[PDB]
Write a protein that binds this DNA or RNA. Structure first.
Ligand SMILES: [Mg+2]
Ligand SMILES: [Mg+2]
Ligand SMILES: [Mg+2]
Ligand SMILES: [Mg+2]
Ligand SMILES: [Mg+2]
Ligand SMILES: [Mg+2]
Ligand SMILES: [Mg+2]
Ligand SMILES: [Mg+2]
Ligand SMILES: [Mg+2]
Ligand SMILES: [Mg+2]
Ligand SMILES: [Mg+2]
Ligand SMILES: [Mg+2]
Ligand SMILES: [Mg+2]
Ligand SMILES: [Mg+2]
Ligand SMILES: [Mg+2]
Ligand SMILES: [Mg+2]
Ligand SMILES: [Mg+2]
Ligand SMILES: [Mg+2]
Ligand SMILES: [Mg+2]
Ligand SMILES: [Mg+2]
Ligand SMILES: [Mg+2]
Ligand SMILES: [Mg+2]
Ligand SMILES: [Mg+2]
Ligand SMILES: [Mg+2]
Lengths: 52, 147, 211, 204, 95
RNA sequence: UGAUGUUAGGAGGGCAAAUCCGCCGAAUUUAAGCAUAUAAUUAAGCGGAAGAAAAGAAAAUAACUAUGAUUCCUUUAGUAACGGCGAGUGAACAAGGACCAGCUCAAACGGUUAAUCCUUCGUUUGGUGCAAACCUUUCGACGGAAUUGUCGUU
RNA sequence: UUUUAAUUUAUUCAUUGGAAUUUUUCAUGUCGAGUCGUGUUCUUUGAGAUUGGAGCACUAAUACGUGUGAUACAUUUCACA
RNA sequence: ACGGACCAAGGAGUCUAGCAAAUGUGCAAGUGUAUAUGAUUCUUUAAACAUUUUAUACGCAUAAUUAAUGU
């Protein structure tokens, strides 16, 4: 019988979390990778795309 | 994750990997640490030799905060200083550093390793060993006792 | 047991399932606690919800170099600031009737703390627009202009926190001042070898003084 | 005052005067019922030290309790169990005889009132004698007095069956502090339960 | 170990008078009641036995008095104090 | 001083239990058998309360440069210690946090005057409601309790 | 519709009681008893020449006293309450 | 030698604690932000983000050995 003291969550190291966020921002700046995720950006000019 | 467990590979086999002739029964040798000294003797003796019996005096109410004492050797003693600060003392020759190790969490200075030749240093602490104090004296330093 | 393993030790032999407790609401409860102590502040109407505590040392050779907050000033420390134990309670000042001052350093430290606190508060009259002197060491009341122009500042809560240690761990000395004829290890060992008879002589001094 | 002299006299109990007085007092208590009311405290100085006051709603009762040990309740003295549990004739009770005296009058006879304290008035080979102070929580004399009307609040019902009198404090272990009574607060069972607990993080 | 109240500490960790070097910082009604009560109550039986043993006046009787008091009260200290008090009483009665 | 009273005014009794307080009290099981030990200061049994209960303002720690009523969380620590020293069992002080609060009798002192308290019967001020009702109010009279001790000071 | 923070406004007159420190003095009081404690028996605890509780027998001192400082004693020093 | 007249649905190495070996990842004489607190966090969010405006909470590691005073 299922119990409520099954270990539901996990603990994650802080440095690995930060590293992953950093590596995920960097991937947001490559045109090829963004296209391969399913976004239709064939008419964009720059992939970082800063706006005023 | 149940996806990767070993029991799923035996799922069409009869005995689940435990054997036709010797079954998987429940406690066929005792419970916990049961048979030590009778029929588990060989395991106990070759893996945990000094297990049985008692030796020594009793100490009835310990209070471990009375004897707490972390230590440090003389090797790590110039390394408590920043490198640019370490550079300045090795250049000038009429000044020496005075280091208080209790402010860093150490209580007793211990005497393994080699201090730099002809580089005086003054060290404050609560306890010293004989060899450490001799090594500090030899290069031209001094030990100081604090409380 | 059969392998090179540590010998088992688990203390699960009673009915352990009846009391197991999983903590599903730790962050919910801290949100609730934060909201309650925030609600108290709006009910105070300007006065802080914290109280002043002294600075004391920790009791053991493991911690004696550290300080922290204690539960209240002593009678002598309050009299050094011209305050009374009863009147002080009506301000955010804690009183401890059983701590003692064995040295001068703690006395002066806590007296300076009390004096600094007593200089940085403005008193609001009991009945509006009726300003009177203090009593029992309480400062005199303030006028409405100062009350108006201090209600718009930010209250300082840093006076309620323990002091922070800034003592350095190295220094510089001149080579000509180093002492060379000092023996630390020998002194340490002769100090231990001498204690028992010195205790005996102190006890005999005590006997002589009593009579 | 007068009370200091009574207090110093009652510290002897083996002088001829006090021996005579005690013998005559204990003779008379046997002829009376097991639970009877007295019109006044027979030891006024001792009653003042406990919370007795001369106010409209304070009353006194006297109880008689039998001495010794009670036998274990098994038919024909036969135990079905291990030899470590076969004992009978020297089983001893957790509660005092003073607490039992308080409970003899506090449960049903005077369920209308509240027990405050009690004190010793004599003994004998068969019985010990006690006098019990009670308070009436519905009289306006106690209900208007600021010093004593804590007793009129319902959380103080049947103190002598929940261990809340002085005699109850004695046998629960609350008269000693520090390293000799380490595991007794806020109660024995609560302390046990706290130490049995397994606490378990969500993330671990 | 022991310290001294005068004479400040030496800044050494071990020994006598050791440690950090902070600056150190430094009825008539009763016997009226006694007389009234005593003439009301008198002495107890074990007190009377101790009194006569003292009144004998030898050293063996003294040791016997100590043992008897120690038995009745159940404590060496207590018994010694009781014998001293009875000795004062016996001395005073002879004057 | 007991008793009596369908005298006037009042209280107790039963139900419910997850959490809480007090008593009483096993064996299965483990030790590869079993008697101490373990299961367990547990299950069953009997009493008593609240929105919480219990605990609580030192006849407490320490041995330091000293802390400072109770409760709970993180650690101390599977440690000091208990045990056919076998199987097994098992706390406290210091440290970091939540919260934070202190008081009354007894005893001492007040006799050109018990100052104190309660029942019943009156009467007197302002508010709120459609009404029903409910706040606030200091004056008196007769009667009783109490010096075998109420109240004030500390 | 609740309940609670600021902000806005007092004034001139009347009486009797209380309370904190500061100066000079005298007075040195009281402080919980068949209770604590000790012996013995049984339980309970990690508590071991016995941790708490209980039954029976004996039974204190007066603050210069009494209790605690984890091994049973005798003579004492010190700290804490 | 034992079970099986037939058909459909159900039906058995899992969960938690504690230790070790193997392997992947991060940092490295250090490493792990405990309980808490903070925030212009607040459908989701019981998640995520932060750390007290020459810097002594605690664990494991950085030093062993002895009944032990200790070294
Ligand atoms: Mg096969
Ligand atoms: Mg098979
Ligand atoms: Mg076979
Ligand atoms: Mg049975
Ligand atoms: Mg029993
Ligand atoms: Mg068996
Ligand atoms: Mg078996
Ligand atoms: Mg069997
Ligand atoms: Mg039950
Ligand atoms: Mg009921
Ligand atoms: Mg309560
Ligand atoms: Mg804890
Ligand atoms: Mg560890
Ligand atoms: Mg034992
Ligand atoms: Mg147990
Ligand atoms: Mg703390
Ligand atoms: Mg009085
Ligand atoms: Mg006292
Ligand atoms: Mg047992
Ligand atoms: Mg101690
Ligand atoms: Mg067969
Ligand atoms: Mg068949
Ligand atoms: Mg199927
Ligand atoms: Mg690994």
């Amino acid at each position: 019988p299922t119990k409520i003291w099954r270990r539901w969550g996990r603990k994650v190291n802080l440095k690995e979390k930060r590293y992953a966020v950093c590596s995920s921002i960097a991937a947001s700046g490559v045109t090829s990778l963004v296209l391969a995720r399913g976004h239709r950006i064939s008419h964009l000019k720059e992939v970082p795309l800063v706006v005023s | 994750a149940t996806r990767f467990k070993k029991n799923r590979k035996k799922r069409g086999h009869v005995s689940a990997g435990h054997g036709r002739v010797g079954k998987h029964r429940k406690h066929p040798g005792g419970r916990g640490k049961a048979g030590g000294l009778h029929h588990m003797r060989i395991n106990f003796d070759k893996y945990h030799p000094g297990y049985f019996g008692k030796v020594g005096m009793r100490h009835l109410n310990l209070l471990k905060n009375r004897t707490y004492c972390p230590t440090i050797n003389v090797d790590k003693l110039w390394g408590l200083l920043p490198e640019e600060k370490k550079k300045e003392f090795s250049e000038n020759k009429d000044i020496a550093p005075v280091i208080d190790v209790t402010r860093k969490g150490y209580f007793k200075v211990l005497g393994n390793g080699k201090l730099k030749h002809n580089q005086p240093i003054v060290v404050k602490a609560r306890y010293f060993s004989s060899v450490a104090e001799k090594k500090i004296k030899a290069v031209g330093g001094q030990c100081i006792l604090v409380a | 047991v059969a392998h090179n393993n540590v010998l088992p030790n688990v203390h699960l032999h009673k009915w352990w399932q009846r009391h197991v407790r999983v903590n599903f609401s730790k962050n919910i409860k801290k949100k609730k606690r934060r909201l309650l102590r925030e609600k108290r502040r709006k009910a105070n109407g300007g006065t802080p919800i914290e109280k002043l505590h002294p600075i004391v040392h920790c009791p053991t050779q493991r911690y004696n170099f550290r300080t922290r907050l204690g539960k209240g000033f002593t009678f002598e420390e309050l009299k050094g600031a011209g305050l009374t134990p009863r009147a002080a309670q009506t301000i955010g000042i804690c009183y401890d009737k059983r701590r003692k001052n064995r040295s001068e350093e703690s006395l002066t430290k806590n007296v300076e703390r009390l004096l600094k606190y007593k200089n940085s508060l403005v008193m609001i009259p009991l009945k509006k627009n009726k300003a009177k002197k203090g009593i029992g060491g309480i400062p005199a009341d303030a006028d409405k202009n100062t009350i108006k122009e201090f209600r718009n500042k930010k209250p300082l809560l840093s006076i309620f926190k323990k002091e922070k240690n800034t003592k350095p761990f190295y220094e510089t000395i001149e080579v000509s001042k180093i002492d060379k004829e000092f023996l630390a290890y020998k002194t340490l060992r002769r100090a231990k070898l001498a204690e028992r008879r010195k205790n005996r002589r102190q006890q005999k001094k005590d006997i002589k003084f009593k009579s | 005052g007068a009370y200091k002299y009574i207090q110093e006299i009652w510290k002897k109990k083996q002088s001829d005067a006090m021996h005579f007085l005690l013998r005559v007092r204990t003779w008379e208590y046997r002829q009376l019922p097991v639970v009877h009311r007295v019109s006044k405290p027979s030891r006024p100085d001792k009653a003042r030290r406990l919370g007795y006051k001369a106010i409209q709603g304070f009353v006194i009762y006297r109880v008689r309790v039998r001495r010794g040990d009670r036998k274990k309740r098994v038919k024909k003295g036969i135990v079905h169990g291990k030899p470590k549990h076969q004992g009978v004739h020297k089983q001893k009770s957790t509660r005092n005889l003073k607490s039992v005296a308080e409970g003899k009058v506090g449960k049903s006879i005077c369920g209308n009132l509240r027990v405050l304290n009690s004190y010793w008035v004599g003994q004998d080979a068969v019985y010990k004698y006690y006098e019990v102070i009670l308070v009436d929580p519905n009289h306006n004399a106690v209900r208007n007095n600021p010093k004593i009307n804590w007793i009129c609040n319902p959380v103080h019902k049947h103190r002598e069956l929940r261990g809340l009198t002085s005699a109850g404090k004695k046998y629960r272990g609350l008269r000693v502090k520090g390293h000799l009574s380490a595991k007794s607060r806020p109660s024995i069972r609560a302390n046990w339960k706290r130490r049995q607990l397994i606490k378990l993080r969500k993330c671990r | 170990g022991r310290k001294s109240t005068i004479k400040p500490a030496t800044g050494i960790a071990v020994g006598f008078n050791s440690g950090h070097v902070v600056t150190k910082r430094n009825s008539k009604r009763k016997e009226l009641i006694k007389d009234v009560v005593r003439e009301i109550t008198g002495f107890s039986p074990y007190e009377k036995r101790i009194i006569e043993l003292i009144k004998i006046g030898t050293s063996a009787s003294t040791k016997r008095s100590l043992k008897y008091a120690k038995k009745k009260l159940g404590t060496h200290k207590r018994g010694k104090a009781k014998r001293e008090e009875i000795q004062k009483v016996v001395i005073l009665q002879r004057r």
